[PDB]
Design an enzyme around this catalytic site. Structure first.
Site, PDB file in Angstrom:
ATOM      1  N   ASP A  74       0.818  -1.202   0.000  1.00  8.97           N
ATOM      2  CA  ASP A  74       0.000   0.000   0.000  1.00  8.97           C
ATOM      3  C   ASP A  74       0.855   1.257   0.000  1.00  8.97           C
ATOM      4  O   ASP A  74       0.533   2.227  -0.699  1.00  8.97           O
ATOM      5  CB  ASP A  74      -0.903   0.051   1.229  1.00  8.97           C
ATOM      6  N   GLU A 105      -5.805   4.650   0.525  1.00 15.71           N
ATOM      7  CA  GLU A 105      -4.656   3.749   0.731  1.00 15.71           C
ATOM      8  C   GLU A 105      -4.138   3.867   2.181  1.00 15.71           C
ATOM      9  O   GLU A 105      -3.694   2.872   2.763  1.00 15.71           O
ATOM     10  CB  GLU A 105      -3.500   4.031  -0.232  1.00 15.71           C
ATOM     11  N   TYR A 112      -4.825  -2.843   7.790  1.00 16.22           N
ATOM     12  CA  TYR A 112      -3.921  -3.983   7.814  1.00 16.22           C
ATOM     13  C   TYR A 112      -3.024  -3.987   9.058  1.00 16.22           C
ATOM     14  O   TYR A 112      -2.757  -5.048   9.635  1.00 16.22           O
ATOM     15  CB  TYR A 112      -3.074  -4.030   6.546  1.00 16.22           C
ATOM     16  N   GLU A 168      -1.964  -3.366  -8.306  1.00 12.87           N
ATOM     17  CA  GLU A 168      -3.212  -3.398  -7.538  1.00 12.87           C
ATOM     18  C   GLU A 168      -4.109  -4.541  -7.951  1.00 12.87           C
ATOM     19  O   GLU A 168      -4.950  -4.969  -7.180  1.00 12.87           O
ATOM     20  CB  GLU A 168      -3.943  -2.067  -7.605  1.00 12.87           C
ATOM     21  N   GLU A 202      -9.695  -1.769  -4.386  1.00 16.21           N
ATOM     22  CA  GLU A 202      -8.647  -2.111  -5.335  1.00 16.21           C
ATOM     23  C   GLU A 202      -9.147  -2.378  -6.756  1.00 16.21           C
ATOM     24  O   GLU A 202      -8.507  -1.979  -7.726  1.00 16.21           O
ATOM     25  CB  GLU A 202      -7.819  -3.301  -4.811  1.00 16.21           C
ATOM     26  N   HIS A 205      -9.842   0.911  -8.089  1.00 14.18           N
ATOM     27  CA  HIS A 205      -8.537   1.501  -8.477  1.00 14.18           C
ATOM     28  C   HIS A 205      -7.962   0.989  -9.800  1.00 14.18           C
ATOM     29  O   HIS A 205      -7.350   1.756 -10.556  1.00 14.18           O
ATOM     30  CB  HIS A 205      -7.514   1.381  -7.345  1.00 14.18           C
TER      31      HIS A 205
END
Ligand SMILES: [Fe+3]
Ligand SMILES: [Mg+2]
Ligand SMILES: [Mg+2]
Lengths: 286, 286
Positions: A74, A105, A112, A168, A202, A205
């Site tokens: 990321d 992001e 995470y 991504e 994602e 993206h």
């Protein structure tokens, strides 16, 4: 020419003036991103610990390593947006999208890292996981690949936007599928719900990258794109069968490799090109 | 000597790794920004039109020019963040703040452009208002001032952060006060509600600038900061008494001049310096 020929890249004295909207397709992708805003605080992790502790040791090993990989990757995606894409692209509608992607992001990275901190209490293990780019040979190959594309002073935006769609979209695809595999097994609700949000983001993206690509006048050749994509698939297939094997959570490596190629084909097609591998999707849960 | 002794600006190999948090004060400002996310779609403008039509022509003139000023100024603030602040600050916590601020500035600009589009249907009038940097001398003085600080290749981050705190805190204060005046008058709940959200955000963005300034080792002199702030005050006072007089909406120009000075004193105090004007807040509604 080279750049003054490209509507996305040429001088726009109205770049910081928001209205009126002229690129409605780009703008609606920004509005879609904006409408799906979420924060790490939205994900309930309060029941995950028990699920985590009942897992096998190699499943904890696989999951913690996927998490460390995602958090690190990321930052590189983000670095690219901050230093390159959000700078070089001159249309307002895409600036808005990339600005919002950066913010998202940072949310993804935080999520995470909260997952890691929730599951792993040992400060030594946390640090080992946070510094994955330096501590984990498996992520090295991916991190360095993405990083080269940021430092490359020659590659066109058309090439670099493809490269980051591969980051991504391909570099993430094996890990996303792994966590969906666990959902099929009814494990860690927090992980699997955050995973739905992030993989959705994602996908958006990557869709955005394909939209920008379409708006380019001077696109890289099909051959050039093929070799970036094929290359990325190989690194990804290796990551998932050799560096951090999906057997550790009970997945068939061979089918995983097939899925990665299905993903790349879908991306090649979304980029205006022809399939490379011509394989089906082995996973009915994806 | 020169920048490798500034924790905020020196090399941070961990700049794109989010955890662990080390600057808890900077990080909590980001979390506060993040928790107050809102969108233009949140603001209902449907009960405003009837009030808009009831006003005198000079009042519509004043409000639309304030809106045009704000829309244009936001994009300059945003330009600065994208090109300078978000690039040059190396601590992760602040990069997260500034990344989120960029997104919010785009939401601010959108909100202002929607307000214009909702109140003003004439296409020629809309275009005149959207091109306010070129079309309106009132806003040129403010725009050029702010823009000079982006182009200034010599001035320190310490000088520049103060200058943009002056932009978001001084150049906006009279206009924000204007809209709160309208609220006091019971007019246009859509506009005044959006103004609550935006002035709050801008207050936070100014607080963040003071927090960063406080974390700087080589600060500019109280003398130098006084010079910047006094200058911004005179420009803003000129703007609201001369270029776009607040009389147009029923406000006293002398009390308004005093409010600007009170705003500047509060900023000087917040930066760790002494008052300049030592005047009270004339407005009970601020
Ligand atoms: Fe602001
Ligand atoms: Mg524009
Ligand atoms: Mg960091």
């Amino acid at each position: 020419m080279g750049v003054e020929d490209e509507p996305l890249l040429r001088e726009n004295p109205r770049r910081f003036v928001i209205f009126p909207i002229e690129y409605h397709d780009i703008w609606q992708m920004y509005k879609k991103a904006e409408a799906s805003f979420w924060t790490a605080e939205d994900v309930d992790l309060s029941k995950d610990i028990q699920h985590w502790e009942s897992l096998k040791p190699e499943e904890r090993y696989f999951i913690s390593h996927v998490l460390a990989f995602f958090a690190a990757s990321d930052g590189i995606v983000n670095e690219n947006l901050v230093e390159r894409f959000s700078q070089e692209v001159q249309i307002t509608e895409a600036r808005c999208f990339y600005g919002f992607q950066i913010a998202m992001e940072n949310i993804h990275s935080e999520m995470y890292s909260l997952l890691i901190d929730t599951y792993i209490k040992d400060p030594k293990e946390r640090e080992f996981l946070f510094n994955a780019i330096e501590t984990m040979p498996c992520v090295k190959k991916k991190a360095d690949w993405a990083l080269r594309w940021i430092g490359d002073k020659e590659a066109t935006y058309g090439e670099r936007v493809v490269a980051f769609a591969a980051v991504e979209g391909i570099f993430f695809s094996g890990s996303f599928a792994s966590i969906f595999w666990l959902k099929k097994r009814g494990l860690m609700p927090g992980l699997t719900f955050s995973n739905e949000l992030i993989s959705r983001d994602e996908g958006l993206h990557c869709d955005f990258a394909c939209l920008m690509f379409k708006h380019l006048v001077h696109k890289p050749s099909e051959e050039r794109v093929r070799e970036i994509i094929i290359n990325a698939v190989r690194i990804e297939q290796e990551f998932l069968t050799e560096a951090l094997p999906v057997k550790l959570i009970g997945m068939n490596c061979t089918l995983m490799k097939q899925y990665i190629e299905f993903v790349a084909d879908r991306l090649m097609l979304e980029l205006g090109f022809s399939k490379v591998f011509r394989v089906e999707n082995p996973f009915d849960f994806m």
